[PDB]
Amino acid sequence: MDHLPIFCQLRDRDCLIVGGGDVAERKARLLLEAGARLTVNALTFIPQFTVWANEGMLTLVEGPFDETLLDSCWLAIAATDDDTVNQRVSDAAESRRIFCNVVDAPKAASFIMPSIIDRSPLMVAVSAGGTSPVLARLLREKLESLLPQHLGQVARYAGQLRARVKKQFATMGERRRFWEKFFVNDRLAQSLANADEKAVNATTERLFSEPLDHRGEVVLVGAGPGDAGLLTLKGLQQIQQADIVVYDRLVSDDIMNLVRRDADRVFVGKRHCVPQEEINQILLREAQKGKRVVRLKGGDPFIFGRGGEELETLCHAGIPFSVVPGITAASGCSAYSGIPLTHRDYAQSVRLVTGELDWENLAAEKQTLVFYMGLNQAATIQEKLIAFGMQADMPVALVENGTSVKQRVVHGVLTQLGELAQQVESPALIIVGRVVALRDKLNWFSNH
Amino acid sequence: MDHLPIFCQLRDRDCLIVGGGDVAERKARLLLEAGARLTVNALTFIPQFTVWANEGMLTLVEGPFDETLLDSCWLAIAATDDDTVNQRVSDAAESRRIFCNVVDAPKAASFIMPSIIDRSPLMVAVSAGGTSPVLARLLREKLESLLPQHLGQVARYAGQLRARVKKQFATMGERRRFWEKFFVNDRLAQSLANADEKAVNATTERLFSEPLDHRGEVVLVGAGPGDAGLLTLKGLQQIQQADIVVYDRLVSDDIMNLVRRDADRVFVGKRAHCVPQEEINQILLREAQKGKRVVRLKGGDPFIFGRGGEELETLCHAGIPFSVVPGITAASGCSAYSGIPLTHRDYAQSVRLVTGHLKTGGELDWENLAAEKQTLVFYMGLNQAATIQEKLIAFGMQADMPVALVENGTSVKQRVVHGVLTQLGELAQQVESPALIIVGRVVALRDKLNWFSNH
Numbered sequence: 001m002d003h004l005p006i007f008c009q010l011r012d013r014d015c016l017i018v019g020g021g022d023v024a025e026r027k028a029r030l031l032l033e034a035g036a037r038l039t040v041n042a043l044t045f046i047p048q049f050t051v052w053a054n055e056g057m058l059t060l061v062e063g064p065f066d067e068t069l070l071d072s073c074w075l076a077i078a079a080t081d082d083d084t085v086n087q088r089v090s091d092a093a094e095s096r097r098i099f100c101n102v103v104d105a106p107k108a109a110s111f112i113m114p115s116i117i118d119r120s121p122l123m124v125a126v127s128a129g130g131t132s133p134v135l136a137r138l139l140r141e142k143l144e145s146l147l148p149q150h151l152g153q154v155a156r157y158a159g160q161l162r163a164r165v166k167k168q169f170a171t172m173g174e175r176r177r178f179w180e181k182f183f184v185n186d187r188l189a190q191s192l193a194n195a196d197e198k199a200v201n202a203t204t205e206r207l208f209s210e211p212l213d214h215r216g217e218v219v220l221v222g223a224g225p226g227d228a229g230l231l232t233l234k235g236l237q238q239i240q241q242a243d244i245v246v247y248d249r250l251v252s253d254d255i256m257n258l259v260r261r262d263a264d265r266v267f268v269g270k271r272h273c274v275p276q277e278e279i280n281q282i283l284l285r286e287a288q289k290g291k292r293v294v295r296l297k298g299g300d301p302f303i304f305g306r307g308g309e310e311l312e313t314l315c316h317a318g319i320p321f322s323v324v325p326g327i328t329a330a331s332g333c334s335a336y337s338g339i340p341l342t343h344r345d346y347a348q349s350v351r352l353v354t355g356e357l358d359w360e361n362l363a364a365e366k367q368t369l370v371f372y373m374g375l376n377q378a379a380t381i382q383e384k385l386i387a388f389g390m391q392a393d394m395p396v397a398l399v400e401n402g403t404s405v406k407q408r409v410v411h412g413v414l415t416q417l418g419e420l421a422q423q424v425e426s427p428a429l430i431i432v433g434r435v436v437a438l439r440d441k442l443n444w445f446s447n448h
Numbered sequence: 449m450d451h452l453p454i455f456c457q458l459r460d461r462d463c464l465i466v467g468g469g470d471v472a473e474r475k476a477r478l479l480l481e482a483g484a485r486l487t488v489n490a491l492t493f494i495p496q497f498t499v500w501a502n503e504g505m506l507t508l509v510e511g512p513f514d515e516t517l518l519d520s521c522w523l524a525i526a527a528t529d530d531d532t533v534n535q536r537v538s539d540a541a542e543s544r545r546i547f548c549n550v551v552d553a554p555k556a557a558s559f560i561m562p563s564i565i566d567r568s569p570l571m572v573a574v575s576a577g578g579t580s581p582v583l584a585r586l587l588r589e590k591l592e593s594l595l596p597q598h599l600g601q602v603a604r605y606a607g608q609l610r611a612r613v614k615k616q617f618a619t620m621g622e623r624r625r626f627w628e629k630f631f632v633n634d635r636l637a638q639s640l641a642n643a644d645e646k647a648v649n650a651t652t653e654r655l656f657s658e659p660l661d662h663r664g665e666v667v668l669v670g671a672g673p674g675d676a677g678l679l680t681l682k683g684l685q686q687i688q689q690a691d692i693v694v695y696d697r698l699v700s701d702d703i704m705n706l707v708r709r710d711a712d713r714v715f716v717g718k719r720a721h722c723v724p725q726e727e728i729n730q731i732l733l734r735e736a737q738k739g740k741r742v743v744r745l746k747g748g749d750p751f752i753f754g755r756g757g758e759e760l761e762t763l764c765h766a767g768i769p770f771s772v773v774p775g776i777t778a779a780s781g782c783s784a785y786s787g788i789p790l791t792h793r794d795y796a797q798s799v800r801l802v803t804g805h806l807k808t809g810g811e812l813d814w815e816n817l818a819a820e821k822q823t824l825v826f827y828m829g830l831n832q833a834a835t836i837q838e839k840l841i842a843f844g845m846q847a848d849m850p851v852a853l854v855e856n857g858t859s860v861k862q863r864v865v866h867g868v869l870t871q872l873g874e875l876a877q878q879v880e881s882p883a884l885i886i887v888g889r890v891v892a893l894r895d896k897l898n899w900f901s902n903h
C-alpha cells in the first residue's frame with residue numbers, strides 16, 4: 001500500500017494550519033471536530049476563523065509564515081493559494097518529523113486527508129492518494145448510504161458492555177459469539193435508536209443470560225483456482241474472522257490477502273508438505289484450544305483435496321466443523337479458457353480424473369475429460385487414449401494457472417498432447433474433449 | 449469525532465516497533481507493505497523477523513527498549529505483552545510528539561490502527577475506537593467483498609485519461625458520469641491486471657467511442673445452488689452493477705435480494721410456458737446493443753449443464769464484450785452440504801457429472817457408467833431414478849452400492865436421503881426437483897461427515 005491509514009487522537013495536541021481561506025477553513029473544521037489545539041497562520045482570515053478566535057476554540061497568527069510555529073506540533077497542513085509558501089511549510093514540517101499535508105498538492109508532503117464517513121465512535125475513511133478524487137467521492141457517497149445513521153449508538157454501547165462481557169464469559173469463544181449475536185440484533189439496534197432504555201436492557205440481560213458455546217471449530221474452505229474474485233461470500237467471511245488459517249500452496253496470494261490480519265497462518269506445503277497426518281493433527285489441536293480453524297484449500301475441498309481425510313475424525317473428537325465449497329479448477333479454468341465443459345450434444349458426461357486407470361471407459365465418448373494431476377503422465381495418456389480408440393483429431397487443451405493474471409493455455413490435438421504438456425509447467429489442468437474446439441468463439445479472458 | 453483519520457506516507461520513513469512476537473509480526477507486515485524503514489526492538493524475535501532481517505527488509509535491535517531508538521522516528525507501536533514496558537514506549541513517544549500505538553490499549557497512546565481494505569492506491573479504513581473490534585471486521589468484510597480486487601488498477605490508470613476526458617467532455621456532469629462508467633468497468637480493470645495492452649486499448653477506446661450513457665456488455669454469472677453465501681465476490685460485484693438481470697428459476701430468492709434495487713429483471717424459466725433459448729440469447733445480445741450492462745444469472749455454474757456457451761457464441765459479432773464468472777455447481781454444493789465428499793482416499797478416481805432425462809437427443813451409456821471406482825453424480829435424473837436403478841445393477845454395479853439424493857442442496861430446506869442402489873427409485877419418490885443422484889461408496893462417509901441440518 002502506498003499509504004498507511006491511522007486514526008490519531010488529537011485531543012489537547014497542537015496542530016498548525018497555514019492559510020486562512022475557504023480550503024483552510026474546511027480543514028480547520030475537521031481538526032477542531034477532533035478536538036485539537038489549533039493554531040492558524042495566515043496573511044488574511046475569512047470570517048469563520050474570527051468567530052472561532054473569539055470563541056476561544058483556536059489561536060490565530062496574522063502575518064507571513066513562521067517556521068517556529070511548528071516546534072510544538074503533531075500535525076501540519078498547508079492550505080494557502082501560494083505553492084511556494086506551502087512547500088516552505090512542508091519542508092519546515094519534515095525537518096521536525098511532523099506529518100504534514102499540502103491539500104492542493106497530494107503527491108507532496110507526508111500525508112493526505114481522506115474523505116470521512118462519521119458514525120462516532122465508528123468511522124470509515126476512503127482515499128485514492130490524489131489519483132482518483134472522483135473515485136473517493138463516489139465511494140464516500142455509497143458508504144454514506146450503506147452505513148445506518150445510528151450505527152454509532154450500537155458501537156458506543158458495545159464499548160460500555162466491554163467490561164461486563166469479559167467478566168461474564170471465560171473464553172474468547174463466548175465473547176466472540178456474544179458480539180456476533182450483539183451486532184446482528186435489530187431489536188437492540190432499533191431500541192438504542194429510540195432511546196427506549198427498557199427494550200435495551202431487556203435484550204441485553206437475555207444476551208448475558210445465554211449459554212454460549214466455548215468449543216472451537218474447523219472449517220474446510222474452497223479457495224477456488226486462484227482469482228480472489230472466485231471465492232464465495234461465505235468463504236471470504238470465514239477467513240475474515242478466523243483465529244488461525246491453514247493454507248497450502250494452491251491458495252493464491254491475492255486470496256491470502258483477504259485473510260483476517262490478526263490471524264495465525266500455518267503453511268502446509270513444500271517448505272515436505274507435511275504429510276497428511278501432520279496436517280490433520282494441527283487442525284484438531286487448534287480447534288481443541290477452542291480456536292476458529294480454517295483449512296484453506298485450492299479449488300473445492302471435496303473434489304481432490306484430502307478434505308474428507310481432514311474431517312473424518314473430528315466427530316469422534318467432538319469438534320464442530322463445516323465445509324464451504326469453492327470453484328474447482330475444472331470449473332474456473334474451463335470458463336476462463338473459453339471452453340465450456342458441456343455444450344449442445346458434445347457431452348452428457350463430464351469427467352474429473354486422478355499402471356493406472358480404465359482407459360476404455362475414459363476413451364469412450366460423448367464425454368468431456370478433465371485430468372487434475374496428469375502433467376508428468378500426459379504422454380502415456382494419449383498413448384492409452386488413442387490405443388483404446390479415441391480419435392486422433394480430437395482437440396485437447398491445457399491450462400496452467402487457470403483463473404490467474406498469469407493464465408496460460410496451450411491448445412492442440414491428442415497427438416500433440418504429450419508435446420504440449422512440456423510447453424507448460426504446474427499447476428496445470430488438462431481438458432480432453434470436443435468442447436475445446438469452440439475456444440476462440442468464446443475466449444474472453446486473455447490473449448496471454 | 450474522537451479520532452482524526454489520516455493517511456500516512458511511510459515509504460522509507462523510520463518507524464519503530466517494540467516487541468518480537470506474533471502481535472509484533474502483524475504490525476511489521478503491515479508497516480512493511482507500506483514501505484516503512486522498519487526497526488524492531490525486542491528481547492527475543494520469532495522466525496519471521498530473522499527472515500526479513502536476513503533479507504534486508506528491516507533492522508533488528510535485540511535487547512531492552514532503547515528510548516534513543518525513537519530519536520528519528522515518525523511512528524511507534526508498542527507490541528509487547530508487558531504493559532509497563534509499553535507504558536514506557538508510549539511515554540517516550542509522546543515526550544517527543546510522535547504518534548504511538550499501544551496494541552492492547554486502544555485509548556492509551558496517540559493513534560489507533562484501523563481495519564484496512566487495500567485497493568492501492570484506493571484505500572478504505574474502518575474503526576470504532578477500540579469499542580467494537582468485532583464490528584470493524586464485520587465492516588472490513590462487507591467492504592472487502594464490495595470492492596472488486598483490481599479497482600486500484602483503474603484508479604492508477606485514470607490519470608492517463610483525465611486529459612482525453614476533459615477534451616471530449618465539456619460538462620462537469622458528463623465527466624462525472626464518464627468516471628462512473630469507467631470505475632465500474634471491471635473488464636478493463638482485468639485487462640490492466642492481465643497486462644493485456646491490446647484489450648486495454650480496445651476497451652479504453654470503446655469507452656470514448658460509445659455513447660456516454662452506454663455500458664453495453666454481457667456477463668454470465670453462476671448463482672450457485674441456492675445459498676446466497678455460495679455466490680462469488682465477483683458474481684456479487686457484477687450483480688450490483690447490472691442494468692438488467694436475466695435469470696432463471698434455479699436462482700435463489702436470497703441471491704435475487706442482492707440484485708440492485710431497480711435493475712430490470714427478466715424471468716426466463718418455467719412458469720407455473722417455457723422460453724425458447726434463441727429468444728433468451730437474443731435478449732442478451734439485443735439489450736447489450738441498446739447499451740445496457742446485462743448479467744445472465746445462472747443457477748449453479750454457467751457452463752455445467754446450463755447451456756451457457758450458446759448464450760455467448762451469439763455475441764461474436766454483434767461486437768459485444770463478454771465475460772463469465774463461474775459459480776459453485778450443484779455437485780460441489782450438495783457434496784459439501786451432505787457430508788458426501790466426491791472423492792476420498794481409495795473410493796476416489798473418476799467423479800462423473802452426467803445428465804438424466806428431460807435432456808435427450810440420443811440414448812444413455814449404461815456400461816461406461818457402471819464401472820467400479822467412480823463417483824456418479826446425476827443431474828436431472830429424478831424422473832429416471834428407477835430407469836437408472838434397473839439399468840445399473842443390470843450392468844454389474846454391485847447392488848449394495850450406497851446411493852443418496854440431495855434436494856435443494858445448500859438451501860435452508862435441503863433434503864438428503866440415502867441407502868443402497870436397490871432403493872434408488874424408492875428414495876427418489878421421496879424427493880422433488882431440484883435434486884442430484886449420487887452413486888458411489890463415498891456416500892457412506894456421511895456417517896462421519898454430516899454437519900448440515902436435514903429436512
Ligand SMILES: Nc1ncnc2c1ncn2[C@@H]1O[C@H](CSCC[C@H](N)C(=O)O)[C@@H](O)[C@H]1O
Binds near residue numbers: 299330373374401
Ligand atoms: N488453479 C489451478 N490451475 C490449474 N490446475 C489446477 C489449479 N488448481 C488445481 N489444479 C489441478 O489440480 C491439482 C491439485 S488437486 C486440487 C483441486 C481443487 N480442489 C479443485 O477443485 O480444482 C493441481 O496439480 C492441478 O493439476
Ligand SMILES: Nc1ncnc2c1ncn2[C@@H]1O[C@H](CSCC[C@H](N)C(=O)O)[C@@H](O)[C@H]1O
Binds near residue numbers: 779
Ligand atoms: N441446489 C440444488 N440442489 C440439488 N440439485 C440441484 C441444485 N441445483 C441444481 N440442481 C440439479 O441441476 C439440475 C439443473 S441443470 C443446471 C445445473 C447448474 N448449471 C449447476 O451448475 O449446478 C437440476 O434439475 C438438479 O438436478
